[PDB]
Structure formats: C-alpha cells, structure tokens
Amino acid sequence: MMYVKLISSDGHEFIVKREHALTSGTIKAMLSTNEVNFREIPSHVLSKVCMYFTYKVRYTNSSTEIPEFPIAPEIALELLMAANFLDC
C-alpha cells in the first residue's frame, strides 16, 4: 500500500510513505505485509530514522543546497546501531 507502519520497541506507530521506508534495505526485505515491528528500536530513535527517510528522499538528486542532517549527541549511539541494522 501507499503508506506503511513502523512500530517501535515502546509501541509508537510511525506511518510513513512506502517509497520512503524502502530507503532501508532491511525494511524493503521485511515488507516484500504493511507493518513492521522493531523490538530493538525505541521511539526516540525510530522517529529520527523516519525524519532521515524524508530528508534522503527530498535531497537526493537535487541541486538545491543540502542542509546538515542533525543528530543530538544523546541519540547518536542508538541511531548508529539502528542505521547499521537498517542499512541506510
């Protein structure tokens, strides 16, 4: 379907465009199914992952000046582990 649901370890449900979620090779495999559960990714990490998908889709193949993707120091370690698992 047009949108997919990504559920964090703490139960937050993130509804993102299917195309945006396909940025993650891991999610792309898990779908090919309209919902994915992440028992190791909390909401403060998964929300940032979804913001990254939006950022990536908006700024890839674009000549408009690309801004820095911000990562708070407090989330950096978990976000790194999540990015590594998600292949994105």
Partner: protein
C-alpha cells in the same frame, strides 16, 4: 511550497508533506485516507491551538522555514469518540539514556 509534518495522536505519528497553500480541511482528507476517519470526526492542533478548517497551513504557522524534512513540524490530532471529542493527547517519545562519560 512543501511543508514537512508529523501528524500525532496518542502513540500514532504520520510523516507526510503538504503545500503551504493547502488547507487544514485538505490535511484532514489526507488523515482520512490514512487512518480512515472522516474530517468531521477530526480536530487538528498546532500546540494547544485548535486549527480552523478554512485556514492554510502557512496561516497556521507551518512554513518551509519551520517544517523541514529533517525537523518536521508537529500537528496534533484528536478524534470524536461517540459525538464528543476526546482531549488532545500526544504520547511523548522515549527518553534517551544518560550521555556516556566518553561524550
């Protein structure tokens, strides 16, 4: 001009974009297409402020400068639970652990 949003209710968060010129009502139609609830059973908020259906997202404070892809703006959502609207409730995200000594 595109505006990047997080439409939030309880433990639900929708990541979507919309035009700055698009209306609050048109955004309710987007929510309808996702969560299958009609606009009459929806209330949209910017912080504690209830948003009027005829107002544009730009008029509601959602501009390209404040609703970025990497830092989307939050739109609160409340549904009508049997003729009476529920209170706006947005469950906060989990807390990050304490910053290690190495940081």
């Amino acid at each position: 001009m595109d505006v990047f949003l997080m439409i939030r209710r309880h433990k639900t968060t929708i990541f979507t974009d919309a035009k700055e010129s698009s209306t609050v009502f048109e955004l309710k139609r987007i929510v309808e297409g996702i969560l299958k609830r009609p606009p009459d059973e929806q209330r949209l908020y910017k912080d504690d402020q209830l948003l009027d259906d005829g107002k544009t997202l730009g008029e509601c404070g959602f501009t390209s400068q404040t609703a970025r892809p990497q830092a989307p703006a939050t739109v609160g959502l409340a549904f009508r639970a049997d003729d009476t609207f529920e209170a706006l409730c947005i469950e906060p995200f989990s807390s990050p652990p304490e910053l290690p000594d190495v940081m």
